[PDB]
Amino acid sequence: AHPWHDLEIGPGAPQIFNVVVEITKGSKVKYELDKKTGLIKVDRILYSSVVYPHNYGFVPRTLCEDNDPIDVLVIMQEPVLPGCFLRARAIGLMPMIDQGEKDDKIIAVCVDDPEYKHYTDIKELPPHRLSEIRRFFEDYKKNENKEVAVNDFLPSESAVEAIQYSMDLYAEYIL
Amino acid sequence: AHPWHDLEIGPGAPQIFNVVVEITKGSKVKYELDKKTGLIKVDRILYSSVVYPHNYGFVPRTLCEDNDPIDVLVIMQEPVLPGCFLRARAIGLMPMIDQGEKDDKIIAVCVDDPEYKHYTDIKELPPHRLSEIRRFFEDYKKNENKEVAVNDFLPSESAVEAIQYSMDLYAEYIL
Amino acid sequence: AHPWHDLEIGPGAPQIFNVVVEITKGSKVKYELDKKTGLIKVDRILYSSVVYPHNYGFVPRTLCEDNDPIDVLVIMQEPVLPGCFLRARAIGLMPMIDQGEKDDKIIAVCVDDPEYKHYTDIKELPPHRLSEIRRFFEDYKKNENKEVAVNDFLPSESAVEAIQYSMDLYAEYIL
Ligand SMILES: [Mg+2]
Ligand SMILES: [Mg+2]
Ligand SMILES: [Mg+2]
C-alpha cells in the first residue's frame, strides 16, 4: 500500500484520522514521504542543532496548495518510527509562512495514547508546549537562510476545517 | 510485497520460518501489522510502565482463530526494527487467555544470531527468562482493565504443531 | 514501490544517486534488502563486537557480478533508518575480496547534509576515517572464519566508473 493514496484516512475523518509519521520526536533528520514511490526519503539533515519537538507526518488522502498532503505534529508519550501510522485527533492549528508560501500545521494527539487521548483542544496543553513548538518552526530553517513566520495558534475547530478542506482538494484532484 | 501474504513462510517451515517484527525489544509502543494495507500501525501506547521483553511479531502465511497470523517472541542479541523480517526457530509455546480468547505465543530464537541459533528448546534457557516473559504478558494490559491468564510453557514440539496448524488454516481460508 | 527496481536511480547518476539504506551507523545487525520482496531482512547478527562505521546500503537499478546492487557506505552527520533512501555523491571506491569474490564498496556522502555535501573526494577526509572503514571490513567477518582482503582506496572517478558499469549491467540483465 502507498501510504498517501492507498491507506484510508480513517472512518472518523476529519475529526479523527490516520497520520503517517515521517519524523520521530527528537530527530535531526528531516525525512519526507517520497510522493512517487511511497518510500521515506531523507530530504535533508537540519542545518541547526535543533530537533523535531514531536512526532511529525502527514494525513493520507489529503492535499494542500503546496501539492503535499496536510502536515501534522502529534503530541504523545513515545517516539514513533518513520513509515508507521497512528490514529490522531486534531486539537489545534498553527498557521505559518515559509518563504511567502502557506504551510499551516495541524497540532494533534494520538487517540490510542492513554495519557493524551483525552485532549480536545490546544488550550488544555501546558502553554510552554505551544511556545516550544512555535519556536521550533521559527528556528529550524534559519541557518538555511529561509524565512519562516509563525502566527498565533487557532482552536481545534479551525484545525478540523483545514483537514476537511484538504480532503476535498484531494478528492477533486484525483483522476 | 505485503508482509503477511506475499512474503514466503520460509522453506524450513514449520520448524524454521520467517518472522515479521512488529515491536522492538524494549519498546512501550505496541505496533501491529495493519492487515489491509500491510503497513505497521500504532495500536496503542502500553498503559503501564512496561516494555516488550524481546522482539515480537508474526509469521507470514499463518492464521489463528483470532483472525490474526500467529504471534512470535524472538529471543536474540539485538533489537530489530518494525517491518523487518528475520529467520527463526520455534523452541517453545506459551499458552494464554486474553479476556476469554485464546492468544498463545510462540517462543523462538533467531537462527542467524550466533549466540542463540543453537537453542532448540525453552528448557535450555535461563529460567528467569521464562519467568520475565510470563510476567510481562500477565502485566501489560492490567491497567487497561483487561484480564490475561498465562499457563505453563510447552516444549518446542508443541510450538511446531501450533505453527503447522496455523499454516493449514491460512491455506484453507485463502480464496 | 520495490526499492531496487521501482525507485529511480536519480537524475544525476552516476555522479549523484539515490541510496537505499539497509544498515544504520552504529548497528550490529546486518540487515539486507530481500531482493524478491523488497522488504528489509536480518541477514545475521555480526559475529564480533563491531558496528557499522557509517550508514550503509545499495543503489537502485544497479547490478554487480555478485548478482546484488552496488554497495555504498554513506558518511554523514546522522543515523539513517533501514528502508529509507537518501541522495549521495560518490567520493571514493574501496576494492575488496570476500572469500575470493569481488565485493567493492562505494564511499559516498549525503548531498543533503550541510556538513558533508561539499566533499568530492576521499582524500579530503580525515585519514583516520579511511583507516577505520578499511579496518571494519577486514574485521567484521573474522569470527565467521571468512577471509576478507581490502585493497587501497581509489579516487572518486574510479567510484563513478564502478557505478556506471553497474547501471549498464542492470539495464542489460533486465527482461
Ligand atoms: Mg509535509
Ligand atoms: Mg499478533
Ligand atoms: Mg549489498
Rounded Cα distance between A13 and A19, Å, is: 11
Q: Of C80, C1, C90, which Cα lies nearest the Cα of C39?
A: C1
Rounded Cα distance between A84 and A21, Å, is: 6
Q: Find all residues with CB under 8 Å of B103, minimum gap 6, and list them.
A: B66, B71, B96, B97, B148
Rounded Cα distance between C150 and B33, Å, is: 41
CA of C68 vs chain B CAs: smallest distance (Å): 19
Q: What amino acid occupies position B70?
A: I
With beta carbons under 8 A apart, name residues in chain B contacting C81: 81
Domain residues for C88? Answer: 1-175
- Does an H or E element contain C97, and which? strand C96-98
The residues pairing with A86 across neighbouring beta strands, listed in sequence order, are: A19
Query: Cell digits for B156?
Result: 518446542
With beta carbons under 8 A apart, name residues in chain C contacting B8: 36
Q: What share of chain B is helix, strand, coil (3-state, %, to 5)?
A: 20, 30, 50
Q: What is the CATH number of the domain that holds B168?
A: 3.90.80.10
Query: Cell digits for A74?
Result: 502529534
- Cα A151 to chain centroid distance, Å, stands at 16
Biggest CA–CA distance in chain B, Å, is: 44
Q: Of A171, A174, A170, A1, which Cα lies nearest the Cα of A84?
A: A1
Q: Of A70, A60, A71, which Cα lies nearest the Cα of A18?
A: A60
Rounded Cα distance between A158 and A163, Å, is: 9
Instruction: Work out the end-to-end distance of chain C between its first and last CA atoms, rounded to an integer number of angstroms.
Output: 18
Pairing of strands A55-58, A101-102: unpaired
Cβ <8 Å between B45 and A110 = yes
> How far away, in angstroms, is A175 Cα from ligand 1 center?
22
Query: Cell digits for B53?
Result: 521483553
Contact (CB, 8 A) for A143 and A47: yes
What does residue C57 show for φ and ψ, rounded to 5 degrees?
-170, -145
Query: Cell digits for C40?
Result: 528489509
Contact (CB, 8 A) for A53 and A133: yes
Is A116 a catalytic site residue? no
Q: Of A24, A163, A27, which Cα lies nearest the Cα of A92?
A: A163
The residues pairing with B94 across neighbouring beta strands, listed in sequence order, are: B105
> How far away, in angstroms, is C99 Cα from ligand 3 center?
15
Query: Cell digits for B99?
Result: 479476556
**Residue C47 annotated as binding?**
no
Contact (CB, 8 A) for A27 and A34: no
CA quadruple C19, C24, C27, C29: dihedral, nearest 10: -60
In chain B, how many domains are there?
A: 1
Q: What amino acid occupies position B110?
A: C
CB atoms within 10 A of CB A25: 19
Known binding residues of A for substrate: 30, 44, 56, 140
Q: What amino acid occupies position A51?
A: V
Resolution of the solved structure (Å): 1.8
Judged by phi (left if over 0) then psi (alpha if -120 to 50, else beta), residue A62 lies in: beta
How long, in residues, is chain A?
A: 175
